[PDB]
Design a protein around this ligand. Structure first.
Ligand code: CA
Ligand code: CA
Ligand code: CA
Ligand code: CA
Ligand code: ZN
Ligand code: ZN
Lengths: 351, 543, 543, 351
DNA sequence: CCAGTCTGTAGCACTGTGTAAGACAGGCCAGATC
DNA sequence: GATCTGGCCTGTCTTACACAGTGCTACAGACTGG
DNA sequence: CCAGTCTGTAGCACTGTGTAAGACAGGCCAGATC
DNA sequence: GATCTGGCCTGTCTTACACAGTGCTACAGACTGG
């Protein structure tokens, strides 16, 4: 639980308040650059290294059989855990492109070969979604599950633009939460199956999820409709009793009232939550720790490291999880002159 | 005589007068001499209320695509209702604008005078001209830098009615009812949207412009019903979007920018394949096929490598979202040609095909002696960049025979003489206001003139154009006759129009703002629109 | 029916209108409606030429002391011919000004209207009022800081005709022909000299102002012959220079500045001798005796020590050079009194004569509880300085009974009640426009009211005034009746007049400059003088 | 012949382009501050110390019997050499006060007592001038002489304001050279005597002088009338054949074309001349050396040290002689921001 | 004679700009001392 | 004989405040027709 | 018809502001190598 | 199998240029009276 102020050596005009960090096979990958992919990086995915507080970025390359990805901004990431068939993958769906349109097309990201000399190769296979497809949306969550013995994915939440009847060019930027029908995504084939549950009172947004051993826990998120951020922690239990994916849910007592959180996995099922924002006006400053097992979430309030005055007195801030208790956070630098790399970075680590 | 209230509004706006100042001077001239020479304040504003957009009830056949039918909305808050929750991308960006439809109908009702005058002149009947109307709209967007105050960048979207013609009822390939005579003067360049953003970032720019794009993509379908001269009539619309510089052209079109290897915006040629053969190409690039190519890039349906697909798709790498006519901008259009003849001469003073490896200094020597040379004869001081004035004055047969003076051989002299001669033969073919009328002679000769030019460059000066060609030169040598035939002119669509508007905007910030950025925009936009209405220019006759 | 050219000039200047803008609007209103409502440009400027100084031929009896007799010079270059030779002190400083005499005669001929009106009203003859005239001139100099543009400091010397009276032919202690009714409103504060220097450095300020001072020192001797109302008449002149803040009063007067130990500008008292006994002093200080004292310092004709002579001469250390009437400034005149009652109350909440050693914090406690107190009753947010508004509202018997609420004892309450009562009894005695007319009642009581005030401070609150007295308080308690009898008012000479003029100067620099610092000052001065002429206000009636 | 860029520790707003440095008894005294004497220094004279490139200023005090001096700006200084009666003195006359008026009253400055602790005592006796008085003027020169064996003073040169007939308030700041009648000042009593010489073609200004063994040499100066800075070096020889001070002179061949020069004495009669300005536009950059004896001036061009770029590219500059080959020069610092101590100091020394 | 109705003038909400009244500090001098 | 510290004092920064302008707005007043 | 007399407009002298066309460097990759 | 440098490419700073306003000025041009 300690911070070190980092610095942007170069390639600093390339991080935007919505972005993602893919943690797999050592080095971490930045995803969702501002502006369309330049010539320097025909893919867009970056590799990020941290060396004595310096934050360097290098240009990843791609496979040949893979597709090329548009830099989605605030999508839903899901660590498709290392197992059959092709470990280990990341499922990305669907965010919104740098033109304010949305994907409705999930992608599977994997690693192919290395090095030779500190070099990587990635691949991004577009995976079709048949069904019963889910609507394109942003801020929702995907999470992998596995039960006797099938591996599937649960998808829930998310805002969208008004459906294209009352979508008017005076409301063309207003949003509304998607209808709460959780989706189930089978990786092969994409036989998506939507389901509902009378416990899904209202679909929320920006709600960090946690899936383990075919049981998932959704924490506090944001809701525009009631304009309240409810504390009702949610749990849901899915089971593929073929040929039926029977699903049930349960409200629980305590769920933290935080949105836009940065979850770092440390142990097998130990997750330290930095958390972005407590209320709609003041962001949270403290930390949290969450264990989980077949009992449920075991809450705890770990040591909140003293943040600098500059970060604490700023309105907004964000970041990603470097993985293994290490995580990157960033604040918009508010002052003259705009560098224009106006995002100062802090590395923060547990223990 | 009491004075027409519209004239008083114009005399408050057409000369940047304040509002308090106007009242004080009005009270003065009232109390002094026995007469109400200027209308009072509130009645002047009331008399203005019908000039702004949002006053004339109109109809649309059919109802527009996802566009509310209300016809009285004034200045819409440009954010278009961003959910202000600070967890999403911030709702900071400040912008104000009209609705595309209502602004267009306002400008049309304004031009009602000239449309009725043209119906009188052409001697067309009136009970028989209620349907076949055809309006061409030239839009233009640009970034304006560093608003001058002690809120730095800005973007300004402006459209202009270019030409209105009639359709009833024969073939009527063209019946020009009204052709605007000053399509470049800012006096007719109507602002429609203003945004306190920066030109660079593609995120916020698309996020705010989106609604306007939807209006465009919905409006070309239906037709408009407007009551003018007592008769309700139907209009069509074409949108020949041109008003963009190359950088924004690419950013909207999706291609990389700027010093790319896919130079042309119309053909598919790279540096080399156009360097070798210059003037033999056909217009290919289109908006819809660029969408198609972007799809072919994203899916990569042939599993080719990075550079392999980048070559297969001709640099298409980003989903374009604003259909743009890819037309050359005649405004600069010559700085490249100018500095290119400059390099030709700086490599003629020293014999370059016998000394193809100059030093860091020998070229300095040759350019400096060329500079003192042209100071001797044409009186042209050394300059940094080929601005318009130096470009015009240098690109002359006089300076060409002047650079003859220092080149030793006498065949290179005749070569560059013929080169400059054909180039002057071919320049006003594109810089004309309408070569269909001004000088079609050189237009009919332009194909052969340009081919002789290309042959002369490839036989004489190909020491440099093996695989290298300056961007401007490709469009100026290959597609110009095609473009002129496609549109009817080149100079008559220059972005420079909205460029001249820039001054106005910043000027209006210094004397008429509120000022507090929630209202500052709204007021600048209102005053600009007032300043650019044909009506309040018809009252500033100034014979 | 055309309009008076003078009115058109006024309507160009009295509302900061530009020059190009004026021409454009004139052409508009000409071409629109059938008549020449505004005169054209060149004839307007020609019609103005007689308003500026340097037009009316005049005479001086006798010839002035070392002043060239020419009467038509316009805007003199202010440096008065500095030998530009680089080895001397640089000739950099830029300044422009009129000549004192010519500007004065211009303003007088302007006021010819009101002087003839007053001769009509008083029913005085005309063949018998050719000699006995008496003009009082109030001058005012100040520094204006940080001209706001994309040349930082500035100084502006301005005079104003205060009152003109008649002398023929009896005793005529006073025959008020014209008494200006707004002696502080910037509408009558005529600029005469402008200099791009800083207020601080005595060197360049004296270097440029010198000629003006020599002019004035030569002018009080002779008399002036001017032709007004067909009759040539003789004028005298008095120069009651007042328009200086304390700091400049000292710098011109020679005394050290500012937080000296010789507080008064009239008496010779130090901090202590005035602290013990307050209201018993007589006005002594004069310009000529200050010259004498400076001589006594410089020669040191008694071989006394440094501090010993510094005491013998009463702080006189620098040769004064501008005779200044040592007059209280009514503008602030209370910020000291206000913050002093504030300290009185901040030391009444605590018991100060029983706890004469507060901590760094106990006074913070007392002031903070006083602040919440007066927020409860008088609704006064905490401030950092006793500006004008807070000084007015706080110094009230209501707030005094409000500060009674927290003080424990009930005798201190009555003491501070009587104190504030006498203070309000005595404030309008000096802040009046003319206490000889507005409220002479409190003036006749002012001596006794002030003595009761002094006795109450020395019996109740002398815990602080042993040897300490705030500067303003000495002048407000000692000589106020003396001053009011000396002049006739106090508020009627506030420097604040030229102070308001400051917000004009910047304005004129922003819209009417040339601009290039050679001509910029010339143009600003010309337009200012135009804006402050009684004539072009008589045309802006605005009933 | 080397420079060291010094710095203004504090009390830097107190040096103006016209000033003087009195070298006597070790420490040197600055004279002619800008603006009237403040309270901090009721006299005005300063003491200056140089300590590892730092330029510190301390407040001198005065005697009790002495007069107090107005800070003249560009007066004529004369080292009344240490001898009978009361060595060693400085004669100051007359400059112009910080109000643009002139003295016409010479002052004798001497030292009285010390220390105790690094403290000094000075005295400034106003010495009356009877005659045949000189006129108040600035930029002229005074010098001491001693002829068989009487010690007198020679005074020559100087501009003034127009005599008070055509002195007009449009010419009230124009100047004209005083009439060239050299004056002889007897120090006690002040029985000044005026004299002329038909070689005194035109009175010049700012012309550095050098007096030795009842023979004086005037170098090049400035003239406004002809607007030329003549090269005609002047020599003049005075002799008190009582009761007549008979004087003669002679033009000589070479006299340097410089004005506003800074003369440092090194040898018994060896003077290194830094010089301020060669021409009316470009200031001189080089140095000079001048010996003298009963033969005359022996000229030389010593080593001109390389000045920095900003001092050579500046328009104007000035300074004084610290004495003993050490000298102080200063340039108006032209750039943003004005410190406002906009005078950078360089110490420059011979050998 | 009085209602209606206009018109002028005052006031509101907003940020940018000068001022100068106090925060202060540190630096010299007197004192307090080595 | 030589050296450091509280007193104070004044030149420097800074920040609460006043107010400038601007367009929009609402009431009060004064005309004008019945 | 012709001259005087007006009048509108073009042009001059000046700094201050935006622009973007080149100066460039440096940093990664390919190349050249350990 | 692992490491450094010339090529070049491109994002960054900077500086010559156009030109904006502004008052003053001079010329041409056109009215209007003899
Ligand atoms: Ca532009
Ligand atoms: Ca551009
Ligand atoms: Ca002041
Ligand atoms: Ca002031
Ligand atoms: Zn092409
Ligand atoms: Zn007194």
């Amino acid at each position: 639980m300690s911070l070190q102020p980092l610095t942007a050596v170069n390639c600093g005009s390339l991080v935007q308040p919505g972005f993602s960090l893919l943690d797999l096979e050592g080095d971490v990958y930045l995803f969702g650059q501002k502006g369309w992919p330049k010539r320097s990086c025909p893919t867009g995915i970056f590799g990020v290294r941290i060396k004595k507080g310096e934050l360097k970025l290098r240009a990843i390359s791609f496979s040949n059989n893979s597709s090329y990805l548009p830099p989605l901004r605030c999508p839903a990431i899901a660590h498709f855990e290392a197992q059959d068939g092709k470990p280990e993958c990341y499922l990305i769906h669907g965010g919104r492109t740098p033109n304010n349109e949305l994907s409705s097309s999930l992608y599977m990201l994997s690693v192919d070969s290395r090095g030779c000399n500190r070099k990587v190769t990635l691949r991004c296979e577009e995976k079709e979604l048949v069904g019963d497809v889910p609507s394109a949306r942003y801020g929702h969550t995907l999470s992998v599950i596995n039960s006797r013995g099938k591996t599937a994915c649960v998808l829930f939440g998310g805002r969208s633009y008004m459906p294209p009847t009352e979508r008017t060019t005076q409301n063309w930027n207003s949003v509304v939460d998607c209808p709460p029908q959780v989706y189930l995504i089978d990786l092969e084939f994409g036989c998506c199956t939507a389901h509902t549950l009378p416990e899904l009172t209202d679909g929320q947004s920006f709600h960090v999820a946690l899936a383990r051993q075919d049981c998932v826990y959704f924490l506090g998120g944001h809701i525009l409709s009631s304009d309240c951020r409810p504390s009702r922690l949610i749990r849901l239990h899915v089971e593929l009793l073929l040929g039926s994916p029977v699903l049930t849910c349960t409200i629980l007592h305590e769920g933290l009232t935080i949105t836009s959180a940065i979850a770092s996995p440390i142990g097998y099922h130990e997750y330290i939550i930095f958390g972005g924002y407590q209320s709609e006006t003041q962001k949270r400053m403290e930390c949290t720790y969450v264990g989980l097992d077949d009992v449920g979430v075991h809450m705890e309030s770990r040591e909140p490291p003293q943040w600098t005055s500059e970060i604490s007195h700023s309105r907004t801030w964000f970041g990603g999880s470097l993985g293994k208790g290490t995580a990157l956070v960033a604040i918009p630098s508010e002052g003259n002159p705009t560098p224009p790399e106006a995002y100062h970075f802090y590395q923060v680590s547990f223990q | 005589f009491g004075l027409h209230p519209a004239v008083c509004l114009a005399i408050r706006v057409n000369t940047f007068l304040s509002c308090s100042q106007y009242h004080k001077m009005y009270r003065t001239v009232k109390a002094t001499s026995g007469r109400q020479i200027f209308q009072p304040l509130h009645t002047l504003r009331n008399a203005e209320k019908e000039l702004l957009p949002g006053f004339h009830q109109f109809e649309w056949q059919p109802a527009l695509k996802n566009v509310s039918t209300s016809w009285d909305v004034g200045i819409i808050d440009g954010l278009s209702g961003w959910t202000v929750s600070v967890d999403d991308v911030p709702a900071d960006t400040i912008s104000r604008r009209f609705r595309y439809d209502v602004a267009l109908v306002s400008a049309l009702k304004d031009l009602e005078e000239d449309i009725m005058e043209g119906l009188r002149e052409r001697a067309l009947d009136d009970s028989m001209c209620t349907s076949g109307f055809t309006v061409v709209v030239k839009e233009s967007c640009d970034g304006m830098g560093d608003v001058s105050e002690k809120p730095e960048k800005a973007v300004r979207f402006s459209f202009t009615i270019m030409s209105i013609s009639i359709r009833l009822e024969g073939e009527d390939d063209g019946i020009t009812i009204f052709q605007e005579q000053k399509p470049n003067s800012e006096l007719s360049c109507r602002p429609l949207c203003l945004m306190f953003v920066d030109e660079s970032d593609h995120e916020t720019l698309t996020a705010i412009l989106g609604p306007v794009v939807a209006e465009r993509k919905a409006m070309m379908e239906s037709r408009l019903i407007i009551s003018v001269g007592g008769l309700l009539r139907s209009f069509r619309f074409f949108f020949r979007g041109t008003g963009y510089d190359e950088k924004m052209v690419r950013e909207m079109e999706g291609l990389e920018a700027s010093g790319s290897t896919y130079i042309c915006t119309l053909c598919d040629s790279t540096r080399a394949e156009a360097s070798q053969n210059m003037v033999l190409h056909s217009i290919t690039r289109s908006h819809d096929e660029n969408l198609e190519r972007y799809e072919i890039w994203r899916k990569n349906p042939f599993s080719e490598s990075a550079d392999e697909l980048r070559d297969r798709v001709k640099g298409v790498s980003a989903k374009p979202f604003m259909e743009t006519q890819p037309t050359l901008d005649a405004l600069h259009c010559d700085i490249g040609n100018a500095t290119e003849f400059y390099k030709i001469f700086q490599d003629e003073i020293g014999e370059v095909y016998q000394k193809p490896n100059p030093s860091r200094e020998e070229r300095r020597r040759w350019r400096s002696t060329l500079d003192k040379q042209l100071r001797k004869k044409m009186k042209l001081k050394p300059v940094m960049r080929m601005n318009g004035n130096y470009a015009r004055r240098l690109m002359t047969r006089e300076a060409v025979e002047a650079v003859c003076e220092l080149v030793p051989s006498e065949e290179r002299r005749e070569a560059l003489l013929k080169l400059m001669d054909l180039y002057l033969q071919m320049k006003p073919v594109w810089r004309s206001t309408c070569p269909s009328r001004d000088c079609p002679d050189q237009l009919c000769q332009y194909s052969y003139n340009s081919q002789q030019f290309a042959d002369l460059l490839s036989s004489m000066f190909k020491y440099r154009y093996d695989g290298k060609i300056t961007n401007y030169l490709h469009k100026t040598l290959a597609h110009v006759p095609e473009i002129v035939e496609r549109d009817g002119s080149i100079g008559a669509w220059a972005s420079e129009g909205n460029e001249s508007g820039n001054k106005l905007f910043r000027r209006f910030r210094k004397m008429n703002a509120r000022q507090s950025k929630t209202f500052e925009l709204e007021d600048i936009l209102k005053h600009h629109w007032l300043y650019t209405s044909k009506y309040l220019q018809k009252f500033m006759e100034a014979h």
